[PDB]
């Protein structure tokens, strides 16, 4: 039963390496774990920092475009206010334009009627001048006729006075001449009566 | 048995001590994994965290970059509209000034029209008066003429009247003279016959 | 006495008869005178008849002309009255015409002013109408926007629930493979240890038996 | 009778004086009449020359009144013609004016109608203005609400997008973790099987060394024993050779 004891001794001689190798065994068991895990973690940190450096850039650009948006918003607000004011002023101006045009139209009509009245007055003046000239000529003609009629009246008067004086003087001369004839009648009477009485007696003594 | 049991106990204790002296090293390796995996597990979490944050920033960036373009378009058309509104505004102000000028000239022209109308009223009044006096004088001359003609007619009747009066007075005066002379002759012959018969009585 | 009174009475008788004779002779003389100044008037009768004839014609015409002076006087007053009535009617109608003309002037003025006010009102109404129409267009385009907004929202919700579903399934697969690998390693180590605790004796004693068989088979036989 | 006689004588003388005065006056009268009887031929002339002047002045005044009356009649003829002309002119003017008034009243009625029509259209438009202001106010409200709706919708879309992207990121993360744990299990299994195989070759090499050693010693002892057996066989054969040699010697050594 000594050969099995020798088997135990050989088992010990085999255990020698089983304890000896433990160092490099556990070292190699650790190196693979460290390698794989450190590779994974390293690549993780790589991608993480890449994403971070992207996020910084994104936030920067975002702040920039926000600033631009605020500027353009203020400018736009002022512009739209100015446009509203402009539209209000346009409304007021169009109202004033309509009112002014109304006043102008009324004035133009009220002036055109005056022009018409002026022209009518001008025609009236013309025809009054004509009618006045005609009346003047008629006045001259009738004046001439009146003057001539008075001339003929005066001539008639002169003729009448002439004939009157003629008849008067004729009557006067007739009466005067008859008186003288009476004078010679008495003279010739006394000288004539006996010159015929004796003429009758001388022949009366005969027969 | 003195070397047997010594070798048996030595081998049993040797293997049962060395195997379990490596077992604890293996468990320490397990702990090393228990830390490594933890750190990897938290880094793997922050990675998704910053990924989410970056997605958020990109979304907001696109949002602002769009609502900025919208405002660019709106403000552009508003600028155009404002240019047009100010242009037409100046046009209207000028037009209103012109209309006011036209109104002033129109009024201050119809005033002078009123003056000319007044002058022409004067002219028409004077002409009407003059024509009236002309017609009056015409009528006066007509009346005077027909008066002269009537008086001419009456004188023409008198001219033939005094003629007949003359003839009548001449007839009467000659008849009276003849009566005187005839009476004288009759007296003559009366004394003639008287003395003739007287002497006839011897 | 006796003689004187008889003488004087004879004188008185003589004087009386003298008065009588003188008055008679004077009456005779006056008779001749009044005969003369009558036989004369009958001789001047002719000029008297002529004069009276001419006067007769004179007033015969005078009455006619004086009748004309009446007729045309009446006619004159008649036409004067008619002219007065026409003057009144003319003054009234001309006053009414002047009034109508003034009313036409003021009326045209009010017309122009009124049309100005109406034109301004219509312009402002047209501006309000334009604003209203543009607002309606705005509402239309905002509806056309909300539609596509909700469509995109639902699509994105679907894609979201898809992504989260795939995430959950990925967690399932992860725990699955982790448990599998753990149990696989555990079973491998178990079979390792069982094989070793079997080879602990099962091959030791039998192999040393075969070795003794070879040694004894070779050393002697 | 004495004084009576004296008084009668005196009265007689008085009567005598009366009749004497009368005969004087009567003789004067007779002389005057006889004087007139001669101048009859001339007082007649004065008579007729007087009545002539009377009638002549009468005719003169008559002709004067005739002339004046004719003048005053012609004057009224002229006045009558004048007024009858002015009436004509006035009635012409009034005819024209009474036409113009009709036209004026016509255009007056028309223009007043037009003015009332305008004053109606103005109130119409002014009411439309208010009923439009209310409308556009309501539309402003509608747009104001719809803008808020669209804003909220866009916000929710942004959020859904964000959480979806986050889900996909975590998905890729877990995929990488999956592959990692795979490549870890591989190396772990490899490292365990390596140890187990080193122990197995430890056992098998022990078996081998023992086997070839304990067999090599036995085979070497066997071959050594064979060589010894052959050596002893050869030495015994050499003993037989020398024995046969000496026996042949003694056989040839045969003699007396």
From Swiss-Prot, chain A:
Chain positions found as Phosphoserine: 7, 22, 27, 63, 168
PTM sites of type N6-succinyllysine: 127
Effect caused by changing residue 19 to S: In EDMD2; no effect on protein level; no obvious effect on nuclear morphology in cultured skin fibroblasts from heterozygous patients
Glycyl lysine isopeptide (Lys-Gly) (interchain with G-Cter in SUMO2) cross-link, renumbered residues: 53, 127, 157, 164, 175, 189
Region (Coil 1A) residue spans: 1-26
Position of the Glycyl lysine isopeptide (Lys-Gly) (interchain with G-Cter in SUMO) cross-link: 157
Effect of residue 122 to P: In CMD1A; dramatically aberrant localization with almost no nuclear rim staining and formation of intranuclear foci
Region (Coil 1B): 37-174
Effect of residue 96 to R: In HGPS; phenotype originally designated as atypical Werner syndrome
Protein's name according to its UniProt entry: Prelamin-A/C
Naturally occurring in which organism (per UniProt): Homo sapiens (Human)
Modifications after synthesis and translation: Proteolytic cleavage of the C-terminal of 18 residues of prelamin-A/C results in the production of lamin-A/C. The prelamin-A/C maturation pathway includes farnesylation of CAAX motif by protein farnesyltransferase (FNTA and FNTB), removal of the last three amino acids (-AAX) by RCE1/FACE2 and/or ZMPSTE24, methylation of the C-terminal cysteine by ICMT and endoproteolytic removal of the last 15 C-terminal amino acids by ZMPSTE24. Proteolytic cleavage requires prior farnesylation and methylation, and absence of these blocks cleavage.
Oligomer status and interactors: Homodimer of lamin A and lamin C. Lamin dimers then assemble into dimeric head-to-tail polymers. Ultimately, two head-to-tail polymers assemble laterally into a protofilament with a uniformly shaped rod of 3.5 nm in diameter. Interacts with lamin-associated polypeptides IA, IB and TMPO-alpha, RB1 and with emerin. Interacts with SREBF1, SREBF2, SUN2 and TMEM43. Interacts with TMEM201. Proteolytically processed isoform A interacts with NARF. Interacts with SUN1. Interacts with MLIP. Interacts with DMPK; may regulate nuclear envelope stability.
Residue window of the full protein shown: 45 to 251 of 664
Gene: LMNA
Swiss-Prot record, chain B:
Modified residue annotations for N6-acetyllysine: 33, 52, 63, 69, 78, 90, 99, 110, 126, 135, 156, 163, 188
Region of interest: Coil 1B: 36-173
Span list, region Linker 2: 174-197
Tissue expression per record: In the arteries, prelamin-A/C accumulation is not observed in young healthy vessels but is prevalent in medial vascular smooth muscle cells (VSMCs) from aged individuals and in atherosclerotic lesions, where it often colocalizes with senescent and degenerate VSMCs. Prelamin-A/C expression increases with age and disease. In normal aging, the accumulation of prelamin-A/C is caused in part by the down-regulation of ZMPSTE24/FACE1 in response to oxidative stress.
Effect of residue 121 to P: In CMD1A; dramatically aberrant localization with almost no nuclear rim staining and formation of intranuclear foci
Cross-link (Glycyl lysine isopeptide (Lys-Gly) (interchain with G-Cter in SUMO2)): 52, 126, 156, 163, 174, 188
Localization of this protein: Nucleus lamina; Nucleus envelope; Nucleus, Nucleoplasm; Nucleus matrix
Effect of residue 15 to G: In CMD1A and FPLD2; interacts with itself and with wild-type LMNA and LMNB1; no decrease in the stability compared with wild-type
Outcome when changing residue 158 to G: In CMD1A; interacts with itself and with wild-type LMNA and LMNB1; no decrease in the stability compared with wild-type; decreased sumoylation; aberrant localization with decreased nuclear rim staining and formation of intranuclear foci; results in increased cell death
Record location of the Glycyl lysine isopeptide (Lys-Gly) (interchain with G-Cter in SUMO) cross-link: 156
Consequence recorded when altering residue 5 to P: In EDMD2 and MDCL
Documented effect of changing residue 44 to L: In CMD1A; dramatically aberrant localization with almost no nuclear rim staining and formation of intranuclear foci
Modified residues (N6-succinyllysine): 126
Processing and modification events after translation: Proteolytic cleavage of the C-terminal of 18 residues of prelamin-A/C results in the production of lamin-A/C. The prelamin-A/C maturation pathway includes farnesylation of CAAX motif by protein farnesyltransferase (FNTA and FNTB), removal of the last three amino acids (-AAX) by RCE1/FACE2 and/or ZMPSTE24, methylation of the C-terminal cysteine by ICMT and endoproteolytic removal of the last 15 C-terminal amino acids by ZMPSTE24. Proteolytic cleavage requires prior farnesylation and methylation, and absence of these blocks cleavage. Farnesylation of prelamin-A/C facilitates nuclear envelope targeting.
Modified residues (Phosphoserine): 6, 21, 26, 62, 167
Impact reported for residue 18 to S: In EDMD2; no effect on protein level; no obvious effect on nuclear morphology in cultured skin fibroblasts from heterozygous patients
Region (Interaction with MLIP): 1-85
Sequence segments annotated as region (Coil 1A): 1-25
Disease with which this protein is associated in UniProt: Emery-Dreifuss muscular dystrophy 2, autosomal dominant: A form of Emery-Dreifuss muscular dystrophy, a degenerative myopathy characterized by weakness and atrophy of muscle without involvement of the nervous system, early contractures of the elbows, Achilles tendons and spine, and cardiomyopathy associated with cardiac conduction defects.
Protein family per UniProt: Belongs to the intermediate filament family.
Name this polypeptide is given: Prelamin-A/C
Species whose genome carries this gene: Homo sapiens (Human)
